[PDB]
């Protein structure tokens, strides 16, 4: 159940990731739909019930779901930097 | 413009307001650019 219950956390941590990239989709609408559809054949080699027989496969994939999907993250890095540090030096808003 | 998000200072909408439709321009460098910005709340001098 271990390893049943990480690769759904995995699972989960990219679908988040990407439903947060979604609320910047005026950020990186080129990146977020085209990878969209270059990381299905990615998800394509950790099929729903998934038994680590051949795990290797499936790391192959995530390296390079790391390497591609890093555009993404340079363009929203840049948004949140402007995002938060207009923020006056306020706790509230910082945390929030 | 899906949605003002929650969090305002994180809210693309806001930048969005009013385009419509943008405009593309290319030039004989072979660089194509795009852009639009529409406002109507002004007055007959601005400070920019």
């Known amino acids: ?96 | 413009k899906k949605q003002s998000f929650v969090l305002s200072p994180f809210s693309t909408q806001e930048e969005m307001s009013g385009l419509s439709f943008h405009i593309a321009s290319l030039d004989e460098s072979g660089v194509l650019n795009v852009w639009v910005v529409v406002e109507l709340p002004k007055a007959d001098i601005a400070g920019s």
């Open chain 1, 1 to 96: 159940l271990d390893k049943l219950g990480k690769r759904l956390e995995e699972v989960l941590a990219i679908r988040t990731i990407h439903e947060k990239f979604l609320y910047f989709l005026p950020a990186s609408e080129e990146k977020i739909i085209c990878l969209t559809r270059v990381f299905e054949p990615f998800t394509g080699l950790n099929p729903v019930q998934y038994n680590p027989y051949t795990e290797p496969l499936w790391k192959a994939a995530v390296s390079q779901y790391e390497k591609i999907i890093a555009p993404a993250e340079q363009k929203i890095a840049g948004k949140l930097k402007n995002y938060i540090s207009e923020i006056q030096d306020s706790p509230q808003q910082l945390l929030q």
